């Protein structure tokens, strides 16, 4: 499923993402935008290390979810990577909350540093009623 901006914003707020571990809703929106373009079936194979990124937040198979073909993989979210490909993003959101419980927080995603950090991110939630 490809979410429309405000639709996703309201969905994330209902799932308790606003302010989760100090992270504003606009930051979560900026992250999903650059990670998958708000596309729940987005997948990306990393030829260099044999891992694959899955879903709206691009959860990696080496650390976060299990796909069975990634060497030395841990499954910190205790989820099959298939779970991060559903139209219902409850599981993808639960795994993203898990990622930020680590010390790096939102910085765990390099894309956030490149495209969101120290910028005006209000635009991601403007007019959404959240």
From Swiss-Prot:
Disulfide bonds join 6-128, 30-116, 65-81, 77-95. Its EC number is 3.2.1.17. InterPro entries: Glyco_hydro_22, Glyco_hydro_22_CS, Glyco_hydro_22_lys, Lysozyme-like_dom_sf. The active site is at 35, 53. It is an enzyme of class 3 (hydrolase). Residues 1-130 form the C-type lysozyme domain. Its main location: secreted. CDD domains: LYZ_C. GO terms for molecular function: identical protein binding; lysozyme activity. SMART domains: LYZ1. One of its GO terms (cellular component) is specific granule lumen. It is found in: Secreted. One of its GO terms (biological process) is defense response to bacterium. It catalyses: Hydrolysis of (1->4)-beta-linkages between N-acetylmuramic acid and N-acetyl-D-glucosamine residues in a peptidoglycan and between N-acetyl-D-glucosamine residues in chitodextrins. Keywords: Amyloid, Amyloidosis, Antimicrobial, Bacteriolytic enzyme, Disease variant, Disulfide bond, Glycosidase, Hydrolase, Secreted, Signal. Gene3D superfamilies: 1.10.530.10. Monomer. Belongs to the glycosyl hydrolase 22 family. It is linked to Amyloidosis, hereditary systemic 5: A form of hereditary systemic amyloidosis, a disorder characterized by amyloid deposition in multiple tissues resulting in a wide clinical spectrum. AMYLD5 primarily affects the viscera, and the predominant clinical features are renal dysfunction of varying severity, and intra-abdominal bleeding. Inheritance is autosomal dominant. Lysozyme C is capable of both hydrolysis and transglycosylation; it also shows a slight esterase activity. It acts rapidly on both peptide-substituted and unsubstituted peptidoglycan, and slowly on chitin oligosaccharides. Lysozymes have primarily a bacteriolytic function; those in tissues and body fluids are associated with the monocyte-macrophage system and enhance the activity of immunoagents. This is Lysozyme C. It comes from Homo sapiens. The lineage of its organism: Eukaryota, Metazoa, Chordata, Craniata, Vertebrata.
């Amino acid at each position: 499923k490809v979410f429309e901006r405000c639709e996703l914003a309201r969905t994330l707020k209902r799932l308790g993402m606003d302010g989760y571990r100090g992270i504003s809703l606009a930051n979560w929106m900026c992250l999903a935008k650059w990670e998958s373009g708000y596309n729940t079936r987005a997948t990306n194979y990393n030829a260099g290390d044999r891992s694959t990124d899955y879903g709206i937040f691009q959860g990696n198979s080496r650390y976060w979810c299990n796909d069975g073909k990634t060497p030395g993989a841990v499954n910190a979210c205790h989820l099959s990577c298939s779970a991060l490909l559903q139209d219902n993003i409850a599981d993808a959101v639960a795994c993203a909350k898990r990622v930020v419980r680590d010390p790096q927080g939102i910085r765990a995603w390099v894309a956030w540093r490149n495209r969101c950090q120290n910028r005006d991110v209000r635009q991601y939630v403007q007019g959404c009623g959240v």
